[PDB]
Structure formats: structure tokens, C-alpha cells
Amino acid sequence: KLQDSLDAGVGNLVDADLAKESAKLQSLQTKQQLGVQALSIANQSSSSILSLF
């Protein structure tokens, strides 16, 4: 019983809660796509002044 309690304590110490990691993965992939699009919009800025010349 004591060895089972020690293994349970190690699992309480280090194990992660995957149910939150799933929603975190969804939100972070969506945020990556949005950040890539924002980075491309930042890349586009230089071209606008070529029309002035």
C-alpha cells in the first residue's frame, strides 16, 4: 500500500492534465495561423509607396 501511495504521489507531482492541453492546442494552432497572416500583412507595407513614384 505504501508503494502504491508513493507512485500516486509522483503522479500527482509530475503528470499533466491533457484535457486542458487539447483546448490549448486548438487555440494555439489558430493563433499561429493568425500570426502568420499578420506577419504577411506586415511584409506587404513597403510596396505602397512605389505607386507614388
Binding site: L6, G9, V10, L13, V14, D15, A16, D17, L18, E21, K24, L25, L28, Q29, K31, Q32, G35, V36, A38, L39, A42, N43, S45, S46, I49
Partner: protein
Amino acid sequence: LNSINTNSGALIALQNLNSTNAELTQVQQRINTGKKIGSAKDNGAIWATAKNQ
């Protein structure tokens, strides 16, 4: 402003995208190992305590 030699907005957007990619790397490690403290880099005290336990 209106410079062609530098683009601070692309630098800030790349910083934000890098932070999002780091968060995705963290979530990917927590998913593929199942531990929120899988190494000493995550948290040395709790990791050493779990190792001794």
C-alpha cells in the same frame, strides 16, 4: 516612417509568432510525454523531488 530600409512591424510580428511557436512546442511536449515537468528544465525542485520519490 515610410522607410524601405527597415520594417519594425515585421520584427514585432515575428516576435509574436516566435512566442506562439514556443507555446506550441511546450504544448506538443506536454502532449507527447504526458508530463508537465518531464525534465529538470521545466522545474528543478519538483523534478528532483519526484525523482527521489
